[PDB]
């Protein structure tokens, strides 16, 4: 039956409806797979001619208008307005064209404003990526999720603004006629949703200068004027048409905010390079002025010892006029600085009658005329209003929210951002979804090409603007919210965040220190997201903290105290993934042990020198929390330390204890190696705790009581066995293969050069006695050991470069301090 | 390395521009003044064009300014888990908070011109039901301090400015025949979550300056990052000062109702709360004492740390005593009956020690004399 | 497997051989006469390499039996269609799909 | 047994005391400090006694002997029946203030936490057993503090909402078996007019209110809504009621439940159906934490929609979670979208289906592609 007939069949235009909200459901939140799909259903012809049926009903219109938006425009059209707050301004020479005002005559300071939305804009905004819809292609030879992401379906939008215009033009003159049989049944469903098709492709920036024109004219044909017709602001309409009104205005309000930033930007070129110009004359002049000078040369070349962060400040600083001494740029250059802050001024409305003659003073009158005529009663329509009202009036204020993510880049750069921006795009567009295989690889990838891109290591500020870290936590954040408790899963994506994370703190001091506010929501994240292997999130809070004693310091004890009271918890059962795999069950957790260790390692030491505070800190909570020490060295029950080391050199080369015995996993672990690797990173963690030698000379009291409790707590009789534990040697044999051990169950070098550094910290040496005592028990065959496999076929073994590390690093330092 | 540092004249165009960027905003345009909150104000609190229209009906549609105060009292009543910051509450409880107040032989004449003034600024604020708003807010934040809580009570300050009867009277109807507990279980969680002197976090502190680290982009001169000990004093001044301006006049209606709550379901002594934050701030400035008392000489950093903590005390000190005078006995025998002595004794034990060691020289008159004033 | 069934005879000599564009306006039907495609709605020609395999290969050997401006028709067994799979969202699996094949124009 | 649970744990309803005393006149007397009063449990309706196994228990109203469950109040732990008074009574004890110890009147017994802490309080929450102790600790004193009208008025509807459709529960399923054919009553009359009244009577107890009420107003009610709500789901009763629906409907049809339970209850047999899943939906709609409940039971209401005996009142229930929880979208499978979908195949245009679908797509402004690309899989294709 004819569609018109659903005017009157009430029963099928509720289900039709209906069907068109299950339509823009199944294709909401850029799935543009099925928004693939759904355009068999839905024809281009069907949508087109829909648009200009007037005899359509209500709901139906609507519906219609806003599937097709939800299918062909929605995607891009997101995309876009995310990156519309982002303002890169390149620097080229169509940017130099930018001017505040056009150029004219009737006013230098404060011409008449330019039309908003018209010229030329240079942001950096990623162009739109469509696909014709075609359903009898070939399908796709690869299997699932490996094949690039759907792209929206493509539509003639050449001819679409066109018809969007016309409507709209149509709507205008109808509404002035008024006509007791308005389009679709009512004024709201007539203007509603071709406003909304408007305003959609006003963000989408289909509109050229021309239809913006025309657009500005429907709106308002008197005041926007360049040198029956009665606008839309005049015309009596509802409330739900004011919010697509305000929807339109505040889009030109963007417009005229970029056209601002776009402006000063250009300022900035044309600025920098006569004061460049200036300050390299003035360096010469500088030069020949030892001639005619004296030792007072200091004060004027300060600036030029000065880096060129607070030389600016000190040449720009000339804006109250009481401080002109110190500044040298000469007064033609003050008097551009002065001359475009004025100009801006004017442009913003601040300093410089019943036409309104401009946007600034015409969205004010409306929002106030409109406010006072009736109570409104929509509450996002007031939101909107009083939004556009506060925009209008706080003209610098609202540039002054912008500023920060403005950015200029030289224009040799350009496609690698668009490169960037595109990745960009993805994850900020996988924000909106639940996470799956196929969002996971589709993120995957686009961060490992953002790794890939030169401009995210050479602009590490206008990386920390666009706030990617952020993106990438609350992408962290949702997986780990997922399955909080019984499963983290998509350990590889997990993975790629922490390791992208881990590699955004190593950029600059400045993204490591934006890292480190982020710090305390990673710990309880970090306390069962462990379970995975590799990246975790804790190495995230570690990257962050370390190499910075800044950081350090700043670092506070109610940080510390989750971290030893998850210790707590992890000496008192095994890893809860190792029980799952079948693992031997041990009274304690020796791989969540470590990694916390290596991160209270990381902590409490900083550029070869402990943080004192962080040390005492730290050993308090590990005195008052007693379990955390493990096994050995508990107190009640424990035994010494050496009784367990030796015990897991037995369990490591003993199988069916080793692990679960079913590296392997490539991560497969080896619970006799984890539990002499966990009291390596203690021994490790204690010696970084130690309190220094010059606090010890000096006889401070926390740093002896403190240093004697290390005594106490670690007994040096089972410490010398721990030196005089031997090694598993490569042993030349079986027709002449290297018989070597596995280093993921073997006894390694490296847990007896965490042990040097703890006798180097805590006892030392200070008689010869002791000194050999030591050294010819364990040192030395470690070293006769070394000098055997320093041989033309094992120097290059895999304990060979560990020896090297461990003697070099750790044992001929110690001797070089323990030589008179 | 300074002598060989790369001059400005050799910097790509680009970074220098992006250096200059924030030079030039941060000393034109956050300098600039621009006070159009007045006229602001001015043109959203007039119903004008549709006076002569004379309607029938007593109902009398709200002008644009009650519109404002209406939808967040809306937002403010509406039943959420957390509180969401909205930049546009921000914006506007700024907007109105800065436009009330507008502010040698200045004679009684034009005084009563200025103060009469500035009840017609809070007037055309507070018969839109600005007053309730904040309470609603205040409520409706339950207990996390952020700049939700600093622009509710820096616009309900700028509304109580000179201990406003009327305003007092409305705040007060408001909660007595509204008897929620929500506001006084906020005012008791902000008061508690308010910080004191840190010692550890002052060492902290003074070793960050001994490294002195720089950054990238050219070079900061020791650079003013984020203080971390009392960080949140004006926050706390101006939370004594809104509960200080709720009492000023001699409420003694007010007085007893923060003492205990007849409407209430339950009882939240602010009084004995405010002793309860006098007393850690009385330890933590003590404490701090003790850290300078083998130190002869106090530097810069302590000196301003002083300044701060006492002008804070001296806030509470002015709060507690708008609690008690006009005199409110009931005030009276809870703080006979609390723990203000305590921190009565430890405050003389640090006044007397304090004057004798800034007495011995002159680079710490400033701190002496806030001292005086304090005591 | 695929059969032509010629609706409107073309010329007969231009046959397009491989190495060329093969530009069609065609109509796709479902079995039970439920239109899933065309292009003429879309008012844009179809244009598809021939013999890369960038069409459904029914299509593919359809398109190279009849000549130029030939308005044929074609019975595409799911042999030789999407079949197992189907095109998700659109057609059902394991259906035989009915196209009214038109080659407009060759480049 | 009584324990020392801090936390969120007595915003409950079990966590209620009343101060009954001994004399039938003028028991609303205020307080007098060590006089006999019984103490009793508003939603189980038992009173605290001295058992001799159990020590401090609570036991039913038939096995409280005023000996063991009396107790008194008293200022302090030092070694102090007075004679009534008509009238209302001194003011003695205020609320939030005036700390009072409470003491066995016959055994002589004090109230205390019992000490020993087990590894249970070694890593799970707080909850230290009062044991009443001959002398035991001296903070055992106790604040005595009010609770609203609108839950103390609820309390007793929790208590007799669970006698009544308990006993509804133990007369349904003593028919399980034992087809009627023509005989006598298989047990006692099932209390069908009781349950009706009591259906009715919770219905619009919990219905939401109008949409045309002030925002400034209508959000108090909201809180009430939520609050009573939540104390219905935590005692239990939600799943009672669901007890309710599992127990009817394994009967197919009037004439089966005729075929068990007799012809009087087969009249009311499709009224309670639809009752129950109206009272379900009021107590699961605009709560979060009551309708998280169903993440688990998913496909129990899912197996449901094909009867036809109450097709709109599952729809409705069903719709009610997924507008409510976000993460039971995450365990729709392809089962259940076919099993929806099927609805549309047997029941007709039913558009309140596609509101269904509609939340499934989208909750809380998060898109969930599985379900997209089901529902596109096995709705969009078939062109029926």
């Given at each position: 039956?004819?569609?018109?007939?659903?005017?009157?069949?009430?029963?099928?235009?509720?289900?039709?409806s209906?069907?068109?909200?299950?339509?823009?459901?199944?294709?909401?939140?850029?799935?543009?797979?099925?928004?693939?799909?759904?355009?068999?259903?839905?024809?281009?012809a069907?949508?087109?001619?829909?648009?200009?049926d007037?005899?359509?009903?209500?709901?139906?219109?609507?519906?219609?208008?806003?599937?097709?938006?939800?299918?062909?425009?929605?995607?891009?059209?997101?995309?876009?307005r995310?990156?519309?707050?982002?303002?890169?301004?390149?620097?080229?020479?169509?940017?130099?064209?930018?001017?505040?005002?056009?150029?004219?005559?009737?006013?230098?300071?404060?011409?008449?404003?330019?039309?908003?939305?018209?010229?030329?804009?240079?942001?950096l905004?990623?162009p739109?990526?469509?696909?014709?819809?075609?359903?009898?292609?070939?399908?796709?030879?690869?299997?699932?999720?490996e094949?690039?992401?759907?792209?929206?379906?493509?539509?003639?939008?050449?001819?679409?603004?066109?018809?969007?215009?016309?409507?709209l033009?149509?709507?205008?003159?109808?509404?002035?006629?008024?006509?007791?049989?308005?389009?679709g049944?009512?004024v709201?469903?007539?203007?509603?949703?071709?406003?909304?098709?408007?305003?959609?492709?006003?963000?989408?920036?289909?509109?050229?200068?021309?239809?913006?024109?025309?657009?500005?004219?429907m709106?308002?044909?008197?005041?926007?004027?360049?040198?029956?017709?009665?606008?839309?602001?005049?015309?009596?309409?509802?409330?739900?048409?004011?919010?697509?009104?305000?929807?339109?205005?505040?889009?030109?309000?963007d417009q005229?905010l970029?056209?601002?930033?776009?402006?000063?930007?250009?300022?900035?070129?044309?600025?920098?390079?006569?004061?460049?110009?200036?300050?390299?004359?003035?360096?010469?002049?500088?030069?020949?002025?030892?001639?005619?000078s004296?030792?007072?040369?200091?004060?004027?070349?300060?600036?030029?010892?000065?880096?060129?962060?607070?030389?600016?400040?000190?040449?720009?600083?000339?804006?109250?006029?009481?401080?002109?001494?110190?500044?040298?740029?000469?007064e033609?250059?003050?008097?551009?600085?002065?001359?475009?802050?004025?100009?801006?001024?004017?442009?913003?409305?601040?300093?410089?009658?019943?036409k309104?003659?401009?946007?600034q003073?015409?969205?004010?009158?409306?929002?106030?005329?409109?406010?006072?005529?009736?109570?409104?009663?929509?509450?996002?329509?007031?939101?909107?209003?009083?939004?556009?009202?506060?925009?209008?009036?706080?003209?610098?204020?609202?540039?002054?929210?912008?500023?920060?993510?403005?950015?200029?880049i030289?224009?040799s750069?350009?496609?690698?951002?668009?490169?960037?921006?595109?990745?960009?795009?993805?994850?900020?567009?996988?924000?909106?979804?639940?996470?799956?295989?196929?969002?996971?690889?589709?993120?995957?990838q686009?961060?490992?090409?953002?790794?890939?891109?030169?401009?995210?290591?050479?602009?590490?500020?206008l990386?920390?603007?666009?706030?990617?870290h952020?993106?990438?936590?609350?992408?962290?954040?949702?997986?780990?919210?997922?399955?909080?408790?019984?499963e983290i899963?998509?350990?590889?994506?997990?993975?790629?965040?922490?390791?992208?994370?881990?590699?955004?703190?190593?950029?600059?001091?400045?993204?490591?220190?934006?890292?480190?506010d982020?710090?305390s929501?990673?710990?309880?994240?970090?306390?069962?997201?462990?379970?995975?292997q590799?990246?975790?999130?804790?190495?995230?809070?570690?990257?962050?903290?370390?190499?910075?004693?800044?950081?350090?310091?700043?670092?506070?004890?109610?940080?510390?105290?989750?971290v030893?009271?998850?210790?707590?918890?992890?000496?008192?059962?095994?890893?809860?993934?190792?029980?799952?795999?079948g693992?031997?069950?041990?009274?304690?957790?020796?791989?969540?042990?470590?990694?916390?260790?290596?991160?209270?390692?990381?902590?409490?030491?900083?550029?070869?020198?402990?943080?004192?505070?962080?040390?005492?800190?730290?050993?308090?909570?590990?005195?008052?929390?007693?379990?955390?020490?493990?096994?050995?060295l508990?107190?009640?029950?424990?035994?010494?330390?050496?009784?367990?080391?030796?015990?897991?050199?037995?369990?490591?080369?003993?199988?069916?204890?080793?692990?679960?015995?079913?590296?392997?996993?490539?991560?497969?672990?080896?619970?006799?190696?984890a539990?002499?690797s966990?009291?390596?990173?203690?021994?490790?963690?204690?010696?970084?705790?130690?309190?220094?030698?010059?606090?010890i000379?000096?006889?401070?009291?926390?740093?002896?009581?403190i240093?004697?409790?290390?005594?106490?707590?670690?007994?040096?009789?089972?410490?010398?066995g721990?030196?005089?534990?031997?090694?598993?040697?490569?042993?030349?044999?079986?027709?002449?293969?290297?018989?070597?051990?596995?280093?993921?169950?073997?006894?390694?070098?490296?847990?007896?050069?965490?042990?040097?550094?703890?006798?180097?910290?805590?006892?030392?040496?200070?008689?010869?006695?002791?000194?050999?005592?030591?050294l010819?028990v364990?040192?030395?065959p470690?070293?006769?050991?070394?000098?055997?496999?320093?041989?033309?076929?094992?120097?290059?073994?895999?304990?060979?470069?560990?020896?090297?590390?461990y003697?070099?690093?750790?044992?001929?330092?110690?001797?070089?301090?323990?030589?008179? | 390395?300074?002598?060989?540092?790369?001059?400005?004249?050799?910097?790509?165009?680009?970074?220098?521009?992006?250096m200059?960027?924030?030079?030039?905003?941060?000393?034109?345009?956050?300098?600039?003044?621009?006070?159009?909150?007045?006229?602001?104000?001015?043109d959203?609190?007039?119903?004008?064009?549709?006076?002569?229209?004379?309607?029938?009906?007593?109902?009398?549609?709200?002008?644009?300014?009650?519109?404002?105060?209406?939808?967040?009292?809306?937002?403010?009543?509406?039943?959420?888990?957390?509180?969401?910051?909205?930049?546009?509450?921000?914006?506007?409880?700024?907007?109105?908070?800065?436009?009330?107040?507008?502010?040698?032989?200045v004679?009684?004449?034009?005084?009563?011109?200025?103060?009469?003034?500035?009840?017609?600024?809070?007037?055309?604020?507070?018969?839109?039901?600005?007053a309730?708003?904040?309470?609603?807010?205040?409520?409706?934040?339950?207990?996390?301090t952020?700049?939700?809580?600093?622009?509710?009570?820096?616009?309900?300050?700028?509304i109580?400015?000179?201990?406003?009867?009327?305003?007092?009277?409305?705040?007060?109807?408001?909660?007595?025949?509204?008897?929620?507990?929500?506001?006084?279980?906020?005012?008791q969680?902000?008061?508690?979550?308010?910080?004191?002197?840190?010692?550890?976090?002052?060492?902290?502190?003074?070793?960050?300056?001994?490294?002195?680290?720089?950054?990238?982009?050219?070079?900061?001169?020791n650079?003013?990052?984020?203080?971390?000990?009392?960080?949140?004093?004006?926050?706390?001044?101006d939370?004594?000062?809104?509960?200080?301006?709720?009492?000023?006049?001699?409420?003694?209606?007010?007085?007893?109702?923060?003492?205990?709550?007849?409407?209430?379901?339950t009882?939240?002594?602010?009084?004995?709360?405010?002793?309860?934050?006098?007393?850690?701030?009385?330890?933590?400035?003590?404490?701090?004492?003790?850290?300078?008392?083998?130190?002869?000489?106090?530097?810069?950093?302590?000196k301003?740390?002083?300044?701060?903590?006492?002008?804070?005390?001296?806030?509470?000190?002015?709060?507690?005593?708008?609690?008690?005078?006009?005199?409110?006995?009931?005030?009276?025998?809870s703080?006979?009956?609390?723990?203000?002595?305590?921190?009565?004794?430890?405050?003389?034990?640090?006044?007397?020690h304090?004057?004798?060691?800034?007495?011995?020289?002159?680079?710490?008159?400033?701190?002496?004399?806030?001292?005086?004033?304090?005591? | 497997?695929?059969?032509?069934?010629?609706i409107?005879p073309?010329?007969?000599?231009?046959?397009?051989?491989?190495?060329?564009?093969?530009?069609?306006?065609?109509?796709?039907?479902?079995?039970?006469?439920?239109?899933?495609?065309?292009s003429?709605?879309?008012?844009?020609?179809?244009?598809?390499?021939?013999?890369?395999?960038?069409?459904?290969?029914?299509?593919?050997?359809?398109?190279?039996?009849?000549?130029?401006?030939q308005?044929?028709?074609?019975?595409?067994?799911?042999?030789?269609?999407?079949?197992?799979?189907?095109?998700?969202?659109?057609?059902?699996?394991?259906?035989?799909?009915?196209?009214?094949?038109?080659?407009?124009?060759?480049? | 047994?009584?324990?020392?649970?801090?936390?969120?744990?007595?915003?409950?309803?079990?966590?209620?005391?009343?101060?009954?005393?001994?004399?039938?006149?003028?028991?609303?007397?205020?307080?007098?400090?060590?006089?006999?009063?019984?103490?009793?449990?508003?939603?189980?309706?038992?009173?605290?006694?001295?058992?001799?196994?159990?020590?401090?228990?609570?036991?039913d109203?038939?096995?409280?002997?005023?000996?063991?469950?009396?107790?008194?109040?008293?200022?302090?732990?030092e070694?102090?029946?007075?004679?009534?008074?008509?009238?209302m009574?001194?003011?003695?004890?205020?609320?939030?203030?005036?700390?009072?110890?409470?003491?066995?009147?016959?055994?002589?017994?004090?109230?205390?936490?019992?000490?020993?802490?087990?590894?249970?309080?070694?890593?799970?929450?707080?909850?230290?057993?009062?044991?009443?102790?001959?002398?035991?600790?001296?903070?055992?004193?106790?604040?005595?503090?009010?609770?609203?009208?609108?839950?103390?008025?609820?309390?007793?509807?929790?208590?007799?909402?669970?006698?009544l459709?308990?006993?509804?529960?133990?007369?349904?399923?003593?028919?399980?078996?034992?087809?009627?054919?023509?005989?006598?009553?298989?047990?006692?009359?099932l209390?069908?007019?009781?349950?009706?009244?009591?259906?009715?009577?919770?219905?619009?107890?919990?219905?939401?209110?109008?949409?045309?009420?002030?925002?400034?107003?209508?959000?108090?009610?909201?809180?009430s809504?939520?609050?009573?709500?939540?104390?219905?789901?935590?005692?239990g009763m939600?799943?009672?009621?669901?007890?309710?629906?599992?127990?009817?409907?394994?009967?197919?049809?009037?004439?089966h439940?005729?075929?068990?339970?007799?012809?009087?209850?087969?009249?009311?047999?499709?009224?309670?159906?639809?009752?129950?899943?109206?009272?379900?939906?009021?107590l699961?709609?605009?709560?979060?934490?009551?309708?998280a409940?169903?993440?688990?039971?998913?496909?129990?209401?899912?197996?449901?929609?094909?009867?036809?005996?109450?097709?709109?009142?599952?729809?409705?229930?069903?719709?009610?979670?997924?507008?409510?929880?976000?993460?039971?979208?995450?365990?729709?499978?392809?089962?259940?979208?076919?099993?929806?979908?099927?609805?549309?195949?047997?029941?007709?245009?039913n558009?309140?289906?596609?509101?269904?679908?509609?939340?499934?797509?989208?909750?809380?402004?998060?898109?969930?592609?599985?379900?997209?690309?089901?529902?596109?899989?096995?709705?969009?294709?078939?062109?029926?």
């Open positions: 039956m004819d569609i018109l007939e659903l005017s009157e069949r009430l029963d099928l235009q509720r289900f039709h209906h069907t068109l909200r299950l339509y823009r459901a199944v294709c909401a939140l850029g799935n543009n797979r099925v928004a693939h799909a759904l355009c068999s259903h839905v024809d281009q069907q949508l087109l001619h829909a648009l200009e007037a005899h359509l009903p209500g709901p139906l219109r609507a519906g219609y208008y806003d599937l097709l938006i939800s299918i062909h425009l929605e995607s891009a059209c997101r995309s876009r995310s990156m519309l707050s982002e303002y890169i301004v390149p620097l080229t020479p169509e940017t130099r064209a930018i001017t505040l005002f056009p150029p004219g005559r009737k006013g230098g300071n404060a011409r008449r404003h330019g039309l908003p939305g018209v010229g030329v804009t240079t942001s905004r990623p739109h990526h469509f696909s014709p819809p075609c359903f009898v292609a070939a399908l796709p030879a690869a299997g699932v999720a094949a690039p992401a759907r792209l929206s379906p493509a539509i003639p939008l050449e001819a679409l603004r066109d018809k969007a215009l016309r409507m033009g149509e709507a205008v003159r109808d509404g002035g006629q008024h006509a007791r049989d308005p389009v049944g009512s709201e469903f007539q203007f509603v949703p071709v406003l909304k098709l408007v305003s959609t492709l006003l963000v989408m920036g289909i509109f050229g200068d021309e239809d913006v024109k025309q657009i500005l004219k709106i308002e044909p008197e005041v926007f004027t360049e040198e029956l017709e009665e606008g839309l602001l005049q015309m009596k309409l509802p409330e739900s048409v004011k919010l697509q009104m305000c929807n339109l205005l505040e889009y030109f309000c005229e970029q056209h601002r930033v776009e402006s000063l930007a250009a300022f900035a070129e044309r600025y920098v390079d006569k004061l460049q110009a200036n300050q390299r004359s003035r360096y010469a002049l500088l030069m020949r002025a030892f001639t005619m004296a030792a007072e040369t200091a004060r004027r070349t300060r600036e030029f010892r000065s880096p060129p962060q607070e030389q600016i400040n000190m040449l720009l600083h000339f804006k109250d006029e009481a401080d002109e001494e110190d500044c040298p740029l000469p033609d250059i003050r008097q551009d600085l002065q001359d475009f802050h004025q100009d801006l001024l004017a442009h913003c409305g601040i300093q410089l009658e019943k309104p003659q401009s946007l003073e015409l969205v004010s009158h409306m929002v106030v005329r409109w406010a006072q005529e009736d109570y409104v009663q929509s509450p996002e329509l007031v939101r909107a209003m009083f939004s556009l009202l506060h925009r209008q009036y706080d003209g610098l204020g609202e540039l002054l929210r912008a500023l920060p993510r403005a950015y200029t030289s224009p750069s350009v496609e690698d951002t668009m490169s960037l921006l595109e990745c960009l795009g993805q994850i900020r567009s996988l924000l909106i979804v639940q996470m799956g295989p196929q969002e996971e690889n589709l993120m995957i686009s961060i490992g090409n953002i790794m890939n891109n030169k401009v995210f290591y050479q602009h590490p500020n990386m920390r603007a666009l706030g990617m952020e993106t990438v936590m609350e992408v962290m954040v949702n997986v780990l919210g997922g399955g909080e408790t019984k899963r998509f350990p590889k994506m997990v993975t790629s965040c922490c390791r992208f994370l881990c590699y955004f703190c190593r950029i600059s001091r400045q993204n490591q220190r934006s890292m480190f982020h710090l929501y990673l710990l309880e994240n970090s306390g069962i997201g462990l379970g995975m590799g990246s975790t999130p804790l190495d995230v809070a570690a990257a962050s903290v370390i190499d910075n004693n800044e950081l350090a310091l700043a670092l506070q004890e109610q940080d510390l105290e989750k030893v009271s998850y210790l707590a918890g992890c000496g008192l059962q095994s890893c809860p993934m190792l029980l799952a795999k693992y031997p069950d041990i009274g304690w957790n020796p791989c969540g042990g470590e990694r916390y260790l290596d991160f209270l390692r990381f902590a409490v030491f900083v550029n070869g020198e402990s943080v004192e505070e962080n040390a005492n800190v730290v050993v308090r909570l590990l005195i008052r929390k007693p379990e955390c020490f493990g096994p050995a508990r107190g009640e029950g424990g035994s010494g330390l050496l009784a367990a080391i030796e015990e897991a050199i037995r369990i490591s080369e003993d199988p069916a204890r080793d692990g679960p015995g079913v590296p392997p996993e490539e991560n497969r672990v080896h619970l006799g190696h539990i002499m966990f009291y390596a990173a203690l021994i490790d963690l204690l010696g970084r705790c130690a309190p220094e030698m010059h606090l000379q000096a006889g401070k009291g926390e740093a002896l009581r240093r004697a409790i290390l005594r106490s707590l670690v007994p040096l009789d089972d410490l010398v721990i030196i005089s534990l031997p090694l598993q040697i490569p042993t030349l044999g079986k027709d002449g293969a290297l018989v070597q051990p596995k280093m993921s169950a073997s006894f390694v070098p490296d847990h007896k050069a965490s042990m040097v550094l703890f006798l180097d910290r805590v006892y030392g040496i200070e008689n010869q006695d002791f000194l050999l005592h030591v010819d364990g040192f030395l470690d070293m006769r050991a070394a000098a055997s496999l320093d041989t033309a076929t094992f120097s290059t073994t895999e304990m060979a470069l560990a020896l090297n590390r003697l070099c690093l750790a044992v001929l330092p110690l001797i070089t301090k323990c030589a008179p | 390395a300074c002598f060989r540092m790369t001059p400005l004249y050799n910097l790509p165009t680009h970074r220098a521009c992006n200059f960027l924030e030079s030039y905003k941060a000393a034109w345009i956050l300098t600039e003044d621009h006070s159009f909150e007045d006229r602001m104000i001015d959203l609190s007039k119903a004008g064009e549709q006076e002569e229209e004379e309607e029938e009906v007593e109902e009398k549609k709200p002008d644009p300014l009650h519109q404002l105060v209406l939808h967040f009292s809306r937002t403010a009543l509406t039943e959420k888990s957390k509180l969401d910051e909205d930049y546009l509450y921000m914006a506007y409880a700024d907007i109105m908070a800065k436009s009330c107040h507008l502010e040698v032989e004679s009684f004449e034009e005084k009563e011109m200025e103060k009469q003034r500035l009840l017609y600024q809070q007037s055309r604020l507070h018969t839109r039901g600005a309730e708003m904040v309470l609603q807010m205040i409520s409706a934040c339950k207990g996390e952020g700049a939700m809580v600093s622009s509710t009570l820096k616009l309900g300050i700028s109580l400015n000179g201990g406003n009867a009327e305003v007092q009277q409305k705040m007060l109807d408001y909660l007595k025949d509204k008897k929620e507990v929500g506001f006084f279980q906020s005012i969680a902000l008061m508690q979550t308010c910080s004191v002197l840190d010692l550890n976090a002052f060492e902290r502190q003074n070793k960050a300056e001994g490294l002195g680290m720089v950054n990238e982009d050219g070079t900061v001169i650079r003013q990052n984020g203080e971390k000990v009392m960080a949140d004093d004006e926050f706390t001044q939370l004594f000062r809104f509960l200080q301006l709720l009492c000023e006049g001699h409420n003694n209606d007010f007085q007893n109702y923060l003492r205990t709550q007849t409407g209430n379901t009882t939240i002594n602010i009084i004995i709360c405010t002793v309860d934050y006098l007393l850690r701030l009385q330890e933590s400035i003590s404490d701090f004492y003790w850290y300078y008392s083998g130190k002869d000489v106090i530097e810069e950093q302590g301003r740390n002083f300044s701060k903590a006492m002008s804070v005390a001296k806030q509470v000190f002015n709060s507690l005593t708008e609690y008690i005078q006009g005199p409110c006995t009931g005030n009276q025998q703080l006979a009956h609390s723990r203000l002595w305590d921190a009565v004794v430890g405050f003389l034990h640090v006044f007397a304090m004057m004798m060691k800034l007495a011995q020289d002159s680079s710490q008159i400033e701190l002496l004399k806030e001292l005086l004033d304090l005591q | 497997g695929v059969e032509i069934e010629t409107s073309g010329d007969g000599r231009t046959f397009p051989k491989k190495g060329q564009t093969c530009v069609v306006h065609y109509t796709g039907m479902l079995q039970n006469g439920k239109k899933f495609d065309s003429r709605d879309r008012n844009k020609p179809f244009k598809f390499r021939i013999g890369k395999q960038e069409v459904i290969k029914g299509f593919e050997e359809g398109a190279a039996q009849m000549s130029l401006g308005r044929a028709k074609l019975t595409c067994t799911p042999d030789v269609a999407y079949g197992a799979t189907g095109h998700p969202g659109v057609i059902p699996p394991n259906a035989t799909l009915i196209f009214d094949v038109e080659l407009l124009n060759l480049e | 047994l009584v324990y020392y649970e801090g936390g969120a744990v007595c915003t409950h309803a079990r966590s209620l005391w009343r101060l009954e005393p001994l004399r039938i006149s003028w028991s609303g007397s205020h307080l007098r400090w060590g006089q006999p009063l019984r103490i009793r449990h508003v939603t189980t309706g038992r009173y605290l006694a001295l058992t001799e196994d159990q020590g401090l228990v609570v036991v109203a038939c096995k409280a002997h005023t000996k063991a469950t009396s107790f008194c109040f008293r200022v302090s732990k070694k102090l029946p007075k004679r009534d008074v008509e009238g009574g001194p003011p003695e004890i205020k609320y939030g203030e005036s700390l009072c110890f409470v003491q066995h009147v016959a055994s002589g017994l004090w109230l205390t936490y019992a000490a020993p802490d087990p590894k249970a309080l070694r890593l799970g929450v707080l909850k230290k057993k009062a044991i009443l102790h001959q002398e035991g600790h001296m903070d055992d004193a106790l604040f005595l503090t009010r609770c609203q009208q609108e839950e103390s008025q609820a309390a007793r509807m929790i208590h007799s909402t669970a006698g459709y308990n006993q509804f529960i133990k007369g349904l399923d003593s028919f399980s078996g034992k087809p009627r054919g023509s005989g006598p009553p298989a047990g006692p009359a209390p069908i007019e009781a349950v009706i009244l009591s259906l009715q009577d919770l219905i619009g107890y919990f219905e939401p209110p109008s949409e045309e009420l002030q925002h400034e107003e209508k959000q108090s009610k909201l809180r809504l939520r609050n009573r709500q939540s104390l219905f789901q935590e005692e939600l799943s009672l009621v669901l007890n309710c629906i599992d127990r009817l409907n394994v009967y197919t049809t009037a004439a439940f005729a075929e068990y339970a007799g012809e009087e209850a087969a009249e009311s047999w499709k009224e309670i159906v639809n009752l129950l899943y109206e009272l379900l939906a009021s699961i709609r605009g709560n979060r934490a009551n309708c409940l169903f993440s688990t039971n998913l496909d129990w209401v899912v197996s449901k929609l094909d009867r036809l005996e109450a097709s709109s009142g599952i729809l409705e229930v069903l719709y009610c979670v997924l507008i409510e929880s976000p993460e039971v979208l995450n365990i729709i499978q392809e089962n259940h979208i076919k099993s929806i979908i099927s609805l549309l195949d047997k029941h007709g245009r558009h309140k289906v596609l509101d269904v679908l509609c939340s499934l797509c989208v909750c809380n402004g998060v898109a969930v592609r599985s379900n997209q690309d089901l529902i596109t899989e096995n709705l969009l294709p078939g062109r029926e």
